[PDB]
Amino acid sequence: XXXXXXXXXXXXXXXXXXXXXXXXXXESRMQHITQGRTSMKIQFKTAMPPTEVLLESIQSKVESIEQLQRKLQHVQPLEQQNNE
Amino acid sequence: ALYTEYLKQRNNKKRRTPDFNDDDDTLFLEEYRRKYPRIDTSRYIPNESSEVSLLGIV
Amino acid sequence: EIAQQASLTESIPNLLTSLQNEWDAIMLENFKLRST
Amino acid sequence: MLCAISGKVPRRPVLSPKSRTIFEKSLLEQYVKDTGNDPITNEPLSIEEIVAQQASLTESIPNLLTSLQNEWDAIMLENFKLRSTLDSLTKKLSTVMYERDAAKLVAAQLLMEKNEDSKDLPKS
Amino acid sequence: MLCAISGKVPRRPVLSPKSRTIFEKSLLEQYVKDTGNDPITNEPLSIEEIVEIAQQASLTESIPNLLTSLQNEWDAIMLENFKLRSTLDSLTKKLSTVMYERDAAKLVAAQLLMEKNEDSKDLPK
Amino acid sequence: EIVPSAQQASSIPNLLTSLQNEWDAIMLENFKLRST
């Protein structure tokens, strides 16, 4: 009981010290930017591959879907003149 | 007023540019680019999983 | 009581470019509709 | 897009006003003429009960707002994965540092006792 | 007042019967669809198990600024989520450094006990 | 029994709710403007 509370109190103290070391930061800044340059490289290369793979398949389907949308805009405009 | 004046309110043109060896301000701006790029790469994964099936269904 | 939209491949833009266009398109249409 | 009774693509869709569901007119008409009911819920329905702003297709303002819910609602679960995992690591750290603090008192006494036994024995 | 998943004020809260905890309907459903369990107690729970159980509207103040607010708030939450994850990795990392010292120390006690055992034999002679 | 806060911590979500509420008027206005 006494040993359980002394460990819970110390764990809260270390938790406050961990929240204090994090709030001060937000040498070290150069490492984070380089970590992003790895990400930017790795991720955006994946993005560009995912994009161009999708684009090849989906730019065709976009045109298919987008040229169909233009048909609603003319199917509507005629609708009103006929109702009128 | 926006339509009459013919001017749209400016959005956050910040995430795109940034700069390395900045300060505490660019430390934030850098950390923003990471989390959104991870969200981006996760947001491209669930699209490619289905792929063209989700598009042709619509 | 009684739909699929394919989120674009280049889906930052949702906060900046897409949302901006939506409130432009709402603004300049109703103004033009008030003119009509 | 489908008719719920047959499963075909209905060429004359008519929606009922008791069980909200898109039926094919020619199919549902016969269902009503059999017995005055809605096929799904078995509530009463007659043939007369069955039934200027230009729209654009549902694409990626309202659809954009429901998108941002998906973003945040998913990211909120991402926080749980790290809140729950933090409560295991800190709990194992608390017991680990306690076993370290309980053991290092015994390292300090054995370093005393083994050297004291060497201090005692060598003098004799 | 708070759903124990996201931290929001729930607009359609639902309570689990395996563990007394008011969750939000959207978030608890996604978890059950991932794995049929309760997020706190890890007890076998389903969607039909849930029992559907203050609303005060925010009046920000006296619209172009509200665009930049929402930008800043998403910008802040992105970093408030990031900071909380690197801290988790480094608390686990520093925990792993303690485990090596814990097991390394109890090997060093074995040699120290031998030096005590060797001493007790010499003292008797 | 008892309060529920555990692994939660005691903004953002209501901003989107507010964005919906103002749009809800935008649609209602556009309807009555188009009818006339």
Query: Residue D27 belongs to what domain range?
Result: 1-51
Identity of residue F26:
I
CA–CA distance from D60 to each of B10, C26, D68 (Å)? 22, 16, 11
Retrieve residue D69's tokens: 């819910």
> CB of B17 within 8 A of CB of A26?
no
Spatial CA neighbour of E22 closest among E12, E32, E37: E12
| D72 to chain F, closest Cα gap in Å | 8
Residue labelled with tokens 């706190």: E40
C25 to chain F, any CB pair closer than 8 A? The answer is: no
Say how far apart CA F18 and CA F16 lie, in whole Å: 5
Identity of residue D78:
E
Beta bridge partners, D13, equal D24
> CB of E98 within 8 A of CB of D100?
yes
Chains E and B physically touch (3 or more Cβ atom pairs below 8 Å):
yes
CA angle, D89 then D91 then D93, to 5°: 65
Residue labelled with tokens 């003119």: C35
CATH code, E2? 3.30.40.10
Q: Is there a contact between B35 and E71 if contact means CB atoms under 8 Å apart?
A: no
Say how far apart CA E29 and CA E77 lie, in whole Å: 23
Spatial CA neighbour of D36 closest among D20, D22, D21, D49: D49
Task: Compute CA D101 distance to the chain's CA centroid, rounded to the nearest angstrom.
Answer: 42
Spatial CA neighbour of C21 closest among B50, D88, D60: D60
Chains A and F physically touch (3 or more Cβ atom pairs below 8 Å):
no
Retrieve residue F10's tokens: 């005691």
Q: What values do phi and psi take at D11, rounded to 5? A: -90, -5
Say how far apart CA D16 and CA F3 lie, in whole Å: 46
Say how far apart CA D7 and CA E20 lie, in whole Å: 44
Spatial CA neighbour of B24 closest among F11, E25, E110, A27: A27
Resolution (A): 3.5
